[PDB]
Design a protein around this ligand. Structure first.
Ligand SMILES: *[C@@H]1O[C@H](CO)[C@@H](O[C@@H]2O[C@H](CO)[C@@H](O)[C@H](O)[C@H]2NC(C)=O)[C@H](O)[C@H]1NC(C)=O
Ligand SMILES: *[C@@H]1O[C@H](CO)[C@@H](O)[C@H](O)[C@H]1NC(C)=O
Ligand SMILES: *[C@@H]1O[C@H](CO)[C@@H](O)[C@H](O)[C@H]1NC(C)=O
Ligand SMILES: *[C@@H]1O[C@H](CO)[C@@H](O)[C@H](O)[C@H]1NC(C)=O
Ligand SMILES: *[C@@H]1O[C@H](CO)[C@@H](O)[C@H](O)[C@H]1NC(C)=O
Ligand SMILES: *[C@@H]1O[C@H](CO)[C@@H](O)[C@H](O)[C@H]1NC(C)=O
Ligand SMILES: *[C@@H]1O[C@H](CO)[C@@H](O)[C@H](O)[C@H]1NC(C)=O
Ligand SMILES: *[C@@H]1O[C@H](CO)[C@@H](O)[C@H](O)[C@H]1NC(C)=O
Ligand SMILES: *[C@@H]1O[C@H](CO)[C@@H](O)[C@H](O)[C@H]1NC(C)=O
Ligand SMILES: *[C@@H]1O[C@H](CO)[C@@H](O)[C@H](O)[C@H]1NC(C)=O
Ligand SMILES: *[C@@H]1O[C@H](CO)[C@@H](O)[C@H](O)[C@H]1NC(C)=O
Ligand SMILES: *[C@@H]1O[C@H](CO)[C@@H](O)[C@H](O)[C@H]1NC(C)=O
Lengths: 368, 413, 205, 99, 50
């Protein structure tokens, strides 16, 4: 608010207008970044009053109406991450609206599977949705229906460890905390640069004007103007570079929303390690948290194997699965779970004769 | 239109200006006016010096109202050299020397920088580069007596003229002859001390006048003498311009719980900005809040459709500025609506605005979409009996206009 | 004789309230774990400034003299505790060349169980005095711990000072040097801890 | 002249810096548009919402000034009915699952 | 290594700290970039002798 300084700052022309135009483009982008992650759902889906999800226990991740109506895990996430013409502007979506979007994404996912991303949400029972997500990783769906209580207990137990982990480390949430720390350190640096001289008599602008004649004060003020304008250009350039990094991370979060939450990704290690079954969004300060659920194979055995088997001079290959032996008998199994089937003409298909294939083995094929 | 350099404006929210509350008045505070310099003797004393034996006070570690030296009609003349008489109350000095004597009314014009005359030559000499002031007044009521006051004297001759502030009270015999006097009168050897003999009935040029000369210096040793400090009343809760003990600022002053230690005077924020002050008289601690400010945004449908607008004062309380408070700021000229719609123009903090039904700008909480309970149960499935082929359009940027600048033609040319 | 100074001789560098915060400052400080002279009253150098302390139960120290000569030729500072007041006088004193106390001028001013601690420094024509008092439970050295000295007086004296001496059961002398310190201010705005940034690599960190 | 050189050179450094940052943003969009050309014009993407909403059938490029337009053709299911469902059925005491 | 120039460069404040902090962030990122690519394997697998 120095009028002597204000008249000198006009000599620099468009610089002060284009700094505000730059920061306005950064500010508008933060609302677009947030919209493209969370606003992927057309309708605000809500979860049924009774939770008949086949033994899978969504309760830590669904809304708690006693609380913003965040989930239990979203309350851990929001607890763990923690005036010189400078102003902070509110986001367009409030933290309660972001939680109403993660609530709708989650309720659609649980009650309708992948279908709410491709059209209208079509209901399906949760154990039948998981049976399809097992087929999606190449494990036959009877493996789920025969192990359903074990699979539900392993899921419920694995969600329990997320509460423990989030109650007992900062190492994971360090990504969101660093985005808070970088923006706070940038504004502190910008404010501390008001105390610098830049070779002027004083850093205090009234203390220049009250102790020098007009032409001398003008020359000292122009050093403060030059250094403070360079201090803003440095801050705005650094915020432009940091906004491009946040936009790359928001485009990745928007892609994991579509491909991991609204779908079942076939892409290796895109939706966590192991063969991806599904994932759930939780909102966090300045970010999103994905709880990626994956099938991990766990207790292998060695077997002898052969590429084909030789029957009536015909070479047989499995339609799906692999031929294996326990040392005395030959079976075909699905590839990702040991389930030996007796080898038959409908487990298999013929191609040519036994003379061609390297490592074929002689066997009976039962014809039903 | 002037922000956009255009006569046609598209639908949107545009920052056109900044709002800033102005200081309602100025405030100044300093400690209780105290420790007056010893001038209470200098201008009231019964005794006074003979001019050949002038008496010096040394003034330090104090303040005084130097304007009284000419605002009071008690003094018949006041003069200043280097300094200006109206400026004295703003100044500070390491020492001041207050030199005092009696002279007859005809001698008064000799008391100036670098002069010559019976006083300047033989009684009291001022330097050519003197900085300070002179008080002079008729003292026929103080220094004259019936039959003559012979207690006042001057030196009529000296062997050499006085150097600046030389103070020769010695009974030296003056020599004008070729023979040395050896401490006694003789051939052109004279005792040079002479009495005024001041009488109440003297003519004004022969009446006594008192003089005080205030002599100023600022040294390598810091200032110890200053003029007085003003202090206004104190105003809370309004935005004001302010000064406490020479710490200047502008903002809103408010009562605070912060217990400063007994020697502490200022409070500072994490980024070294001053956030509180002790009042230097009634020793309360005041928080300082910035004087309220923020962007001003104009919310408009396109000028193809209306010339009505709303205005948002970003982060401002509507008390400071239809009128409607939002968490984004004070919103003016928009009707608050209890319905919710898709967001048209984004205001912030869940609020949006549009032009709608006589039509006006409306402001509403944004709708995220229609609410839907999916008809879930452990044995119900929905299967689509028909389809639609959809054609979506996606637009992606791929290149910019290729530019070249000859920087020597741009900078110089 | 000599002893280690431990983490002592910190004082409030400025008259500013700061709270629940860490502040970094450059000033003349007594360096941490520096080596300080012990006495059970010679003229000593003053250097950039002095930390002075006494461990006491009987009030034997009664004052100080500071200057270049401390004697007649030129102006000097005398400080005396007159039991009813602290007294400060700034004069070319005719006082003793080997002084004791028991049962012209330019400036003047008027105001084991214990460790009584003081800092004297002389910068830009102002003479600064800081002090603290505390109870103690040790005789053999300056007791390990922390206590920041508050400013007592701040005097417009302008004199060149290069040497000093005590007027007067045991006392310690250490020298201030230009150092950077990190100071911890609590919710009450008291200094409660400090780091000497030049002490060791962890303190630089 | 050195005041004009200083200000015009700072003015031109500001322009080139913001064009470098804007070129990086256009390159990210060209890398995305080149990935949609391969995965959706030259293929059929199984990635959800990569090539329009609904299940991707195919897409067509059209040129536009400084850009590309993809016409993404998708199957959207339209007219659902509710049914009772079961994970498996009994027959001769054995369980059957849909193939 | 001029002492006279260094005391003039102090008058520009935080500029010289944030240039060193920027390049240090770039340097630490290059090791992160390398471990995102190559450290995708939990155990150092070996091929058999035959
Ligand atoms: C390989 O698997 C077959 C499974 O059929 C094993 O043979 C069976 O063994 C059980 C007793 O362990 C008998 O009751 C069955 O009658 C056997 N079936 C047949 C077809 O003979 C066989 O023992 C396994 N071999 C090894 C080395 O584990
Ligand atoms: C689900 O988990 C909660 C604790 O997370 C537990 O209290 C509750 O009994 C469980 N079962 C159901 C059906 O909610
Ligand atoms: C048998 O399988 C285990 C588990 O994968 C493996 O560690 C082991 O090396 C295999 N046996 C032999 C003889 O290599
Ligand atoms: C497999 O390797 C063995 C030697 O380890 C060799 O004798 C045999 O012929 C090989 N068989 C095939 C199918 O390659
Ligand atoms: C497999 O069976 C055929 C026909 O009985 C025979 O000629 C051939 O030698 C057998 N091969 C092996 C590896 O036993
Ligand atoms: C200043 O004067 C007022 C009114 O006489 C008095 O209340 C106040 O205590 C004085 N200031 C100080 C610091 O005591
Ligand atoms: C400031 O705004 C709040 C609502 O945000 C309001 O309650 C308060 O009354 C306003 N301030 C004043 C001084 O009225
Ligand atoms: C709008 O909402 C407020 C607060 O709920 C209520 O007082 C008012 O009557 C409502 N008006 C209309 C027209 O709905
Ligand atoms: C039957 O299907 C329609 C269309 O999806 C749905 O709106 C309705 O809720 C379903 N019926 C029941 C009883 O929920
Ligand atoms: C499917 O929808 C089309 C219109 O898109 C309609 O003409 C047709 O009759 C519908 N068929 C069935 C079986 O509902
Ligand atoms: C302290 O000073 C004396 C000086 O003679 C020296 O002998 C001693 O080693 C010093 N101690 C330390 C810890 O520096
Ligand atoms: C802070 O100040 C108050 C008031 O003097 C006191 O009650 C409180 O105990 C102090 N707290 C600490 C941590 O020193």
């Amino acid at each position: 608010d120095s009028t002597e300084c204000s008249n000198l700052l006009l000599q620099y022309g468009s610089f002060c207008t284009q700094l505000n135009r730059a920061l306005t483009g950064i500010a508008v982008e933060q609302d677009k970044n947030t919209q493209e992650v969370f606003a992927q759902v057309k309708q605000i889906y809500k979860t049924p009053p009774i939770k008949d999800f086949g033994g899978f226990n969504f309760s830590q991740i669904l809304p708690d109406p006693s609380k913003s109506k965040r989930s239990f895990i979203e309350d851990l996430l929001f607890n763990k991450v923690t005036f010189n013409g400078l102003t902070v502007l509110p986001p367009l979506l409030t933290d309660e609206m972001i939680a109403q979007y993660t609530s709708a994404l989650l309720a659609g996912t649980i009650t309708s599977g992948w279908t709410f991303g491709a059209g209208a949400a079509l209901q399906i029972p949760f154990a039948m949705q998981m049976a399809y997500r097992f087929n999606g990783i190449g494990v036959t769906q009877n493996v789920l229906y025969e192990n359903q209580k074990l699979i539900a207990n392993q899921f419920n137990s694995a969600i329990g460890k997320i509460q423990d982990s989030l109650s007992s480390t900062a190492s994971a949430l360090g990504k969101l905390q660093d985005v808070v720390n970088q923006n706070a350190q940038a504004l502190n640096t910008l404010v501390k640069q008001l105390s610098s001289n830049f070779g002027a008599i004083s850093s205090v602008l009234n203390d220049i004007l009250s102790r020098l004649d007009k032409v001398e004060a003008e020359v000292q003020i122009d050093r403060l103007i030059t250094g403070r304008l360079q201090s803003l250009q440095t801050y705005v350039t650094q915020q432009l570079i940091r906004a491009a990094e946040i936009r790359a991370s928001a485009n990745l979060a928007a892609t994991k929303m579509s491909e991991c939450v609204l779908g079942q990704s076939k892409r290796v290690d895109f939706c966590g390690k192991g063969y991806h079954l599904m994932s759930f969004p939780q909102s966090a300060p300045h970010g999103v948290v994905f709880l990626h659920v994956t099938y991990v194979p766990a207790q292998e055995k060695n077997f002898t194997t052969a590429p084909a088997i030789c029957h009536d001079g015909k070479a047989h290959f499995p339609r799906e699965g692999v031929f294996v032996s326990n040392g005395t008998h030959w079976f075909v199994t699905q590839r990702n779970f040991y389930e030996p089937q007796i080898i038959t003409t409908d487990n298999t298909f013929v191609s040519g004769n036994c003379d061609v294939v390297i490592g074929i083995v002689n066997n009976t094929v039962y014809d039903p | 239109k002037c922000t956009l350099k255009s006569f046609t404006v598209e639908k949107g929210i545009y920052q056109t200006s900044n709002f800033r509350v102005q200081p309602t008045e100025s405030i100044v505070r300093f400690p209780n006016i105290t420790n007056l310099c010893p001038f209470g003797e200098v201008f009231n004393a019964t005794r006074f010096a003979s001019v050949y034996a002038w008496n010096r006070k040394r003034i330090s570690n104090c303040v005084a109202d130097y304007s009284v030296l000419y605002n009071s009609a008690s003094f018949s003349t006041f003069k200043c050299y280097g300094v200006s008489p109206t400026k004295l109350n703003d100044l500070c000095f390491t020492n001041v020397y207050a030199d005092s004597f009696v002279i007859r009314g005809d001698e008064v014009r000799q008391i100036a920088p670098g002069q010559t005359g019976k006083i300047a030559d033989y009684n009291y000499k001022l330097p050519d580069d003197f900085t300070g002031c002179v008080i002079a007044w008729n003292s026929n009521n103080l220094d004259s007596k019936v039959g003559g006051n012979y207690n006042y004297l001057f030196r009529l001759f000296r062997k050499s003229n006085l150097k600046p502030f030389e103070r020769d009270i010695s009974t030296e015999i003056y020599q004008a002859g070729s023979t040395p006097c050896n401490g006694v009168e003789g051939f052109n050897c004279y005792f040079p001390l002479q009495s005024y003999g001041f009488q109440p009935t003297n003519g004004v040029g022969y009446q006594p006048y008192r003089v005080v000369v205030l002599s100023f210096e600022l040294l390598h040793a810091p200032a110890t003498v200053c003029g007085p400090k003003k202090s206004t009343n104190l105003v809370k809760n309004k935005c004001v311009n302010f000064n406490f003990n020479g710490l200047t600022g502008t903002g809103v002053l408010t009562e605070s719980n912060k217990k400063f230690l007994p020697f502490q005077q200022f409070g500072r924020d994490i980024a070294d900005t001053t956030d509180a002050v002790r009042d230097p008289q009634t020793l309360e601690i005041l928080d300082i809040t910035p004087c309220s400010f923020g962007g001003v945004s104009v919310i408009t449908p396109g000028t193809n459709t209306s010339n009505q607008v709303a205005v948002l004062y970003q982060g401002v309380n509507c008390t400071e500025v239809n009128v409607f408070q939002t968490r984004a700021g004070c919103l003016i000229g928009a009707e608050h609506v209890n319905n919710s719609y898709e967001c048209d123009i984004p205001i912030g903090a869940g609020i949006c605005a549009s032009y709608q039904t006589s039509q006006s700008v409306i402001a509403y909480t944004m709708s995220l979409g229609a609410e839907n309970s999916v008809a879930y149960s452990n044995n119900s499935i929905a299967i689509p009996t028909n389809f639609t082929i959809s054609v979506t359009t996606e637009i992606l940027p791929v290149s910019m206009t290729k530019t070249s600048v000859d920087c020597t033609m741009y900078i110089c040319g | 004789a000599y002893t280690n100074s431990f983490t002592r001789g910190v004082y409030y560098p400025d008259k500013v309230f700061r709270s629940s915060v860490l502040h970094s400052t450059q000033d003349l400080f007594l360096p941490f774990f520096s080596n300080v002279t012990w006495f059970h009253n010679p003229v000593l150098p003053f250097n950039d400034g002095v930390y002075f302390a006494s461990t006491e139960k009987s009030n034997i120290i009664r004052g100080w003299i500071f200057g270049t000569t401390l004697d007649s030729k030129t102006q000097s500072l005398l400080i005396v505790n007159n039991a009813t007041n602290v007294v400060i006088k700034v004069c070319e004193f005719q006082f003793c060349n080997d002084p004791f106390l028991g049962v012209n001028c330019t400036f003047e001013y008027v105001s084991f169980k214990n460790l009584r601690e003081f800092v004297f420094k002389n910068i830009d024509g102002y003479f600064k005095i800081y002090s603290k008092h505390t109870p103690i439970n040790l005789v053999r050295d300056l007791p390990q711990g922390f206590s920041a000295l508050e400013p007592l007086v701040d005097l417009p004296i302008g004199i060149n000072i290069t040497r000093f001496q005590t007027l007067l059961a045991a006392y310690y002398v250490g020298y201030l040097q230009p150092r950077t310190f990190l100071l911890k201010y609590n919710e009450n705005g008291t200094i409660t801890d400090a780091v000497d940034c030049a002490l060791d690599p962890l303190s630089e960190t």
